[PDB]
Amino acid sequence: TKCTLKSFTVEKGIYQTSNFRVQPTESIVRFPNITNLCPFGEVFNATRFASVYAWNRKRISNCVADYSVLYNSASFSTFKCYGVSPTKLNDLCFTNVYADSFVIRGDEVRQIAPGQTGKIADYNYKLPDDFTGCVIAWNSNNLDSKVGGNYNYLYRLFRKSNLKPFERDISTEIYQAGSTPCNGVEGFNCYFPLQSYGFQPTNGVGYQPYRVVVLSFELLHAPATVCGPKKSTNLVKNKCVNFNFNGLTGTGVLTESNKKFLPFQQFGRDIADTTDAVRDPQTLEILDITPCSFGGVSVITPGTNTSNQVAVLYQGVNCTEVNVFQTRAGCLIGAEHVNNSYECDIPIGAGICASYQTSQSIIA
Amino acid sequence: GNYNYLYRLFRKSNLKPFERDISTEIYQAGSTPCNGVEGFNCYFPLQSYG
Amino acid sequence: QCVNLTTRTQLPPAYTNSFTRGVYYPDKVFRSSVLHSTQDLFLPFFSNVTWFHAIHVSGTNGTKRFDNPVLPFNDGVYFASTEKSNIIRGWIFGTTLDSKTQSLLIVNNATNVVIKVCEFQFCNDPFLGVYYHKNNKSWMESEFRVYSSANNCTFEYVSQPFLMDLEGKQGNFKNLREFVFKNIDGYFKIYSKHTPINLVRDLPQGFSALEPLVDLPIGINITRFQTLLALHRSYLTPGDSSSGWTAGAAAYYVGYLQPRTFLLKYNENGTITDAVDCALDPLSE
Ligand SMILES: *[C@@H]1O[C@H](CO)[C@@H](O)[C@H](O)[C@H]1NC(C)=O
Ligand SMILES: *[C@@H]1O[C@H](CO)[C@@H](O)[C@H](O)[C@H]1NC(C)=O
Numbered sequence A: 001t002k003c004t005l006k007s008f009t010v011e012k013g014i015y016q017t018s019n020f021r022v023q024p025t026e027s028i029v030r031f032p033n034i035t036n037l038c039p040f041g042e043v044f045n046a047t048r049f050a051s052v053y054a055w056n057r058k059r060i061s062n063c064v065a066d067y068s069v070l071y072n073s074a075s076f077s078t079f080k081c082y083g084v085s086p087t088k089l090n091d092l093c094f095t096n097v098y099a100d101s102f103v104i105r106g107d108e109v110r111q112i113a114p115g116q117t118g119k120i121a122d123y124n125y126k127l128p129d130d131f132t133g134c135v136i137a138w139n140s141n142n143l144d145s146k147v148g149g150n151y152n153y154l155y156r157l158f159r160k161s162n163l164k165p166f167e168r169d170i171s172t173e174i175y176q177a178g179s180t181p182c183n184g185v186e187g188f189n190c191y192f193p194l195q196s197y198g199f200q201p202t203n204g205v206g207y208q209p210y211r212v213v214v215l216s217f218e219l220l221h222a223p224a225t226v227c228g229p230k231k232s233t234n235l236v237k238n239k240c241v242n243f244n245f246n247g248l249t250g251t252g253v254l255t256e257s258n259k260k261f262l263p264f265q266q267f268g269r270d271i272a273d274t275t276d277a278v279r280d281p282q283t284l285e286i287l288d289i290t291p292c293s294f295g296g297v298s299v300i301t302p303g304t305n306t307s308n309q310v311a312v313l314y315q316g317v318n319c320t321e322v323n324v325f326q327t328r329a330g331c332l333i334g335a336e337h338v339n340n341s342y343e344c345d346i347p348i349g350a351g352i353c354a355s356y357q358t359s360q361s362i363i364a
Numbered sequence B: 001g002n003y004n005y006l007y008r009l010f011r012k013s014n015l016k017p018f019e020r021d022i023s024t025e026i027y028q029a030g031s032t033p034c035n036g037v038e039g040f041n042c043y044f045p046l047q048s049y050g
Numbered sequence C: 001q002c003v004n005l006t007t008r009t010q011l012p013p014a015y016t017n018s019f020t021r022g023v024y025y026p027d028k029v030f031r032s033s034v035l036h037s038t039q040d041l042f043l044p045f046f047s048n049v050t051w052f053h054a055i056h057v058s059g060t061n062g063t064k065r066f067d068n069p070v071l072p073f074n075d076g077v078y079f080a081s082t083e084k085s086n087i088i089r090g091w092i093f094g095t096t097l098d099s100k101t102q103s104l105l106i107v108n109n110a111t112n113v114v115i116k117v118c119e120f121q122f123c124n125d126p127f128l129g130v131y132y133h134k135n136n137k138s139w140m141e142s143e144f145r146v147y148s149s150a151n152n153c154t155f156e157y158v159s160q161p162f163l164m165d166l167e168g169k170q171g172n173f174k175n176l177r178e179f180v181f182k183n184i185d186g187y188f189k190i191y192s193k194h195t196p197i198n199l200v201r202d203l204p205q206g207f208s209a210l211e212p213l214v215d216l217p218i219g220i221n222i223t224r225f226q227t228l229l230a231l232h233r234s235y236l237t238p239g240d241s242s243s244g245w246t247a248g249a250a251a252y253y254v255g256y257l258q259p260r261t262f263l264l265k266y267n268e269n270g271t272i273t274d275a276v277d278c279a280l281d282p283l284s285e
C-alpha cells in the first residue's frame, strides 16, 4: 500500500494494491487416438528386395509416421539424415514421403549422399542437391545372402553418362564401347551394362551387400498430410491448468458440463466469441472451460498514524482459492465479523463496512 | 585445411547470449546411455571445418 | 470403352427457385441460443438455380432425356438430388477431365464408396448400369463404364461394403439428398443432408441445415465437374449398345455459391433453425 501511492504514510481508506491470479498447475494435452500408422514396417521388413536400378517407390500420404521408433531401434548401420536433424522428426508435417528399395554392395553405402560420386552414385542412382531426407541401412548378409553363391542381384557395371536426379534408366541395351554398333552378340564392340552383381557367404563386412532405404520428403503446396505422432497426457478435472486439445490453447478449470454438442462440433464459444466448452478427442466427453480464479487485492488500513494493522480483500474469490469472512464482495482476511451495526467508516461492498474500534483491531 | 578450428554441432538446449561452452561431454542423441563411448546415437560435440 | 449415347430427346433447359436452402455449418463450434453473423460462400436465397432431369415417356417419340453435362466450378456448387430410386450415383471433378491433370472421382454404386483421386480417362458421358431379369427378378449392377485408364493415384477411400436397393419403384419422390461441395485453398469440403419429401417435380420449401461429411485434403485445381447417373437397361427396350438407356424418374438441382454474409440463429441444442440473407432486401439488412 505504501509502495502504490509513492509514500511512507497512507491515510484511512481501502486501496487497490495488486491483482490475485491463480497459477496453472499442469500442462494437460489431449490429442486424438493415434491411428492410421504409416506402413514404415513393411518397407524395411520385406521378404524380397529389388536391384539398385529397380528402386521401387512406395509413396505414402495421409498417415501418421513415427520417425522415432526407427531411429531408436539399435538395429541399423548408418541412420544418416539430411536437411533435418536425426531427432525432433516427429514435430514436422510433410505432404508425402518417398521410399526406396535397393541392395548396394559394401562401400556403395557411402555413395548415396549429397555431393558424392562413385559407381552406384553415377550409374544406378544419383542423389540430388540439398534435400530433406534420411538413409537407413542394415545387415543384408543375414537372410539375403545365399550359401553357395548369391548371384540373384544385378548391378550396372558401366553407363553412358551420369544419372539424372531421382531417375530410373530402364534402358537395357548393349552399349557400344568400341567401334560401329555390333547389333548382336556381346564381345566385339559390344558391352551390356547389366551382367551381374556377385556375392559370397564367406565375405567380410566391406564386401557384403546392404539393404538401404532412402526416405524422401516433400514440402509441396498441397497440405501436409504426413504428420508426426502427437503425444497425450492424462486429464485432471476441477483444477485450473493449461490445456491444448487440437490447437485451442488456454488456461482454465476443466469441469463437466451438461451440454449436448453435435457429432461434428468440437469446440464451443459464448456470445462474445470466448471458448467455454470443448470436446475431448480421445473420449467423447464435453467439458466446461471456466476461467481461472482471479480478482483484485485491496488493503483496508485505518491509517499509519493510528495503527499498522491491515485487512486484505480478495474481490471475486470464494475463500477456497487463497480470520476469514466470506462477503458478497470477496474474502476479508484480517477482520472479525461482529453482529452489531455502525456507520460506514471504510466501504467494502455489498453493504459491508470496516472500521477500527477497541485490544484494538479491525471489525467487519 | 586446418583442424584446430572447431564448432559445436550437438547441444541439449540453446545457448544464452554471451555464454561460453568449453565442455566436451558426449551428446546423447537417442534413448541410449552413452557412458562415454562414441558411435551410434552418441556423437562428439565438436567438429573441424577444413 | 467410351460409347457415345444417341437417340436423346433434346429440349431447352429449365430453372427453379431455391426457397431458402443451401445453408451449412461454417465451422465446428457449438453455439446455443445466439445469432451469429458469418461471411462465407453461401447459396443466395431465392436464386435461379438450374434444374436437370432424366425421364422417358412412352408412346410417341417421347421425352427421353438424360442430363449430365459439364458444369463450371467457380467457388462452389449446390446439389439437391430429388428422386425415389437410386439413379444418382456421384460426381466427377477436375480441370480438363482427361488424363493430363488430376481429378476427383466419387462413385456410390451398390458395392462400396469409390472416392478416388487419379488421372482417369472420363469419357464424354460416364454412364452407369443396372439390369432387370425375369428368372431372377432383381436389379443388379451391369456396367461401370466411367474411366478407361490408370495413373499415379494420390488418394483412395473405399468404404465398408453395403447393399442398396437399386430398384425402379414408381411414384412420388421420397428422398431429398442435398450436397454442398467447397474447396478453400487446400481441401474439398463436402456437406451432406438427407430429409424426407413428398413432392413430384419441384423443390421443397423450408430450412434444412447441411451437416459436414468429409474434409479430404486433396489439393487440386477444380474448375469443372460432371454429374453421374444410372440408366436402366431391361428387356422391354432392346437394341444396340446405346439403344436401351431407359432412366425412369430422376431429377437433380444445381446451384453456385458466392461470398455473402448470413445471420444464423442457433437453437438451444445447438442446431441452426433459420437464417437471414443480409443482402436480399432492406428488411434483411
Ligand atoms: C521389423 O521386424 C522386427 C523383428 O520382428 C521388429 O522388431 C520390428 O518392429 C519390425 N519393424 C520395423 C520396420 O522396424
Ligand atoms: C480412443 O481410445 C480409447 C481407448 O482405447 C477408447 O476408449 C476411445 O473410444 C477411443 N476414441 C476414439 C475417438 O476412437
Ligand SMILES: *[C@@H]1O[C@H](CO)[C@@H](O)[C@H](O)[C@H]1NC(C)=O
Pocket (backbone or CB within 6 Å): A318, A320, A326
Ligand atoms: C462458495 O461460497 C458460497 C457462499 O459462501 C458457498 O455457498 C459455496 O458452497 C462455496 N463453494 C466452495 C467452492 O467452497
Ligand SMILES: *[C@@H]1O[C@H](CO)[C@@H](O)[C@H](O)[C@H]1NC(C)=O
Pocket (backbone or CB within 6 Å): C015, C016, C048
Ligand atoms: C431465371 O428464371 C426464369 C423464371 O424461372 C427463367 O425463365 C430463366 O430461364 C431463368 N434463368 C435465366 C437464364 O435467366
Ligand SMILES: *[C@@H]1O[C@H](CO)[C@@H](O)[C@H](O)[C@H]1NC(C)=O
Pocket (backbone or CB within 6 Å): A260, C267, C268, C269
Ligand atoms: C433438444 O433436444 C432435446 C433432447 O435431446 C429435445 O427434447 C428438445 O425438444 C430439443 N429441442 C428442440 C426444440 O429442438
